[PDB]
Design a protein around this nucleic acid. Structure first.
Lengths: 56, 48
DNA sequence: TATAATCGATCTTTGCCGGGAG
DNA sequence: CTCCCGGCAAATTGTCCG
């Protein structure tokens, strides 16, 4: 039991920082939409850099 | 005949009846301007 | 807080860089 | 050494989105 809890804890940290990077993307219930993690916020066309930083 | 001068156009011009439609893109809808206004929650940049 | 109950359930583009196997 | 194979990262802009 403690082992299961520990591995679930890692996965919870992983989704928080970069969701979808490793394993199934964490989703809100009854939606297929992956939750938007910190990595998703920073990066991409929609990310912090190319959206609010290099242009406004 | 040019209505400004009264003089003819120096050449014969094609004239006739054409069917022309007014499309859904009208200035009244698209003209927009902003000095200052609403800002976004996280970014504090103007809304779109 | 008391019959007993003991292993889950969906699936269909191109370019680059690192790795294991032959 | 030399080479596929898989895993990961990319894929135009304003408007709009009723």
């Amino acid at each position: 039991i403690i082992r299961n809890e520990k591995r679930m804890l890692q996965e919870a940290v992983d989704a928080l920082l970069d969701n979808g990077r490793r394993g199934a993307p964490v989703t809100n219930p009854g939606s297929d939409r992956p939750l938007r993690s910190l990595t998703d916020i920073l990066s991409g066309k929609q990310g912090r850099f190319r959206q609010n930083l290099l242009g406004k | 005949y040019d209505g400004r001068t009264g003089e003819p156009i120096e050449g014969p011009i094609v004239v006739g009846q054409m069917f022309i439609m007014k499309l859904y893109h009208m200035v009244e809808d698209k003209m927009h301007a902003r000095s200052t206004g609403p800002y976004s929650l996280i970014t504090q940049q103007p809304l779109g």
